[PDB]
Amino acid sequence: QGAKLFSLDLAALGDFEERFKGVLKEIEESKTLIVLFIDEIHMLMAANILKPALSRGQLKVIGA
Amino acid sequence: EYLSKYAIDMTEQARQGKLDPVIGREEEIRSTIRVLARRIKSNPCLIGEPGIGKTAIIEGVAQRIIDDDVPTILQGAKLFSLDLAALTGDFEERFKGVLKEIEESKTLIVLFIDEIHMLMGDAANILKPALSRGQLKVIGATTNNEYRSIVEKDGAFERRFQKIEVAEPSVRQTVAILRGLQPKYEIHHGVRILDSALVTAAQLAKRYLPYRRLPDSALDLVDISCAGVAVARDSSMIQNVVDSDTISETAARLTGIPVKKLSESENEKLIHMERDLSSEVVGQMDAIKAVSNAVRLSRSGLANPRQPASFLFLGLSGSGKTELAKKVAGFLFNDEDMMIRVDCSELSEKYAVSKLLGTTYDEGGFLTNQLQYKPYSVLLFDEVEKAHPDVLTVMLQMLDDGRITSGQGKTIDCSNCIVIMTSNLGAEFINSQQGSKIQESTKNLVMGAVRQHFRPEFLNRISSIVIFNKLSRKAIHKIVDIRLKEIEERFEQNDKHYKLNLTQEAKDFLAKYGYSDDMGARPLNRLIQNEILNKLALRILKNEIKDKETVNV
Ligand SMILES: Nc1ncnc2c1ncn2[C@@H]1O[C@H](COP(=O)(O)OP(=O)(O)NP(=O)(O)O)[C@@H](O)[C@H]1O
Prior knowledge:
The structure is cut from a larger assembly and holds 2 copies of chain A.
Chain A: H1 18-30, E1 36-37, E2 61-62
Parallel strand pairs in A: 1-2
Bound molecules: phosphoaminophosphonic acid-adenylate ester.
PDB class: chaperone
Keywords: Hsp104, AAA+ protein, chaperone
Entry title: CryoEM Reconstruction of Hsp104 Hexamer
């Protein structure tokens, strides 16, 4: 319930990606108050995508 | 006539006896004297930590001067002490003509300049030609830092100069030089000092004081303490003074728990620390012993005075491992800030700043700066081998000695600090411990695994390395029940006044569901909020279920 939809359509455009990593706190700010959905981009990211926030045990995401 | 202007002879004050007697330095002095006696490179210098008693030597110098402990050649010489400042015309001139005066003045003194030794922009040669005169006996010093930058550029600076170690005592002799205090410094503010109030301030300020210097930091608090014992006494019969009051009390100023400062120092702490760990985490009796059992070894000087306390931990974050030291530190250093974070994700090359560096904003780094900030510390290493060859090599000094040069090249003691490695190197082998191996074989499997990423020096200098292995629900529910304990003791105490209920649901859920095998109850740790704290507070926050009430799912 308390979660809502976020879906990151990745536009990456110094590392310009860590933004995508910094937001992992911004949702962690909300404290799983949303969900993430990524569509066909699932690949090695920087480095690997995602998890350290999910791998923190947290972070419901809609994978695809 | 500019003689006395910023140049104030303190051999005056030494002839006046204004200056402050201390012990032993003749060693540096006689040399630094003998240095001052050198045609070739005249100028003795102390290179390193400020506040280490530089002109205190000059005192002794001036003392040896006025005592005629000043040796033959230079007995004529004395020291005008410069006062480094002026008003802008500009400054240099005033600071120059003197230079002429004094060598002209025929060596009745020498000059000491302390840490302020200038790379000027308009550098040109400031005092340097005067210094360069083949004449003009002077005394400079600085920390290593400027000594790094400025004096190494020429290096015929040394052709004038001589470096000498800024003399930092032993504690015992610091204690001893402050043991000479007890008959004398008992009565400064008009009391007596016990053997109790005597050595500990050191032992404390050593162990407990972040900043100041061995006799300095030690001698500091006791008069900082006298707010009570000097003023409230004559404001009643206290003659002798005691450690705690003088110290631990006045030590508890910063934090507290003088009992842990006092009633137990390291002695019992260890003695039961095993279960004390087990208190925080049941399970992993291995490291419950080992690291503990080990780090017990860490102290007492079984081995190198210079020597770190070092471990890799293995398991699933949210196994309590990353915590674990925070107990230990809280258990030992009575803090969780002792724990300090080294992200091996972050590590490639450029980190050499982020610890600390000789600054070229590229400025003071952090991590070493943090122990430099936090002289008692615990160092956590975030999936170690994920770091580059960058740190692991500097980790040698960490592997070494329990002491660390900052990136400006300033050593700080980790033999009083902790360093702890994280890695997944047995993750699959955690999965082997999920099959619950003879841990040896799988630790061997790990050992080989961990063996790979590192030169043995890395591998060898570790105090040891331990797995935090498969965690039976035994621990879980306990840990959970411990996990239970943390929030309730935050709140019913003050906030929530809260009496509690537990369905076995949650009791089972949190253990069963809330705990993840792989990702742990680590999320459940957050979930414990969510399905419980978040849930039941939300249940209660209405208040219709009253304060101190409880409803579990
Ligand atoms: N076996 C355990 N004993 C005690 N606390 C545990 C245990 N397993 C997980 N925890 C909790 O999980 C955290 C500690 O997990 P730990 O194994 O130290 O790795 P961690 O890095 O701290 N988890 P995290 O820091 O979010 O990655 C703390 O919140 C503990 O309360």
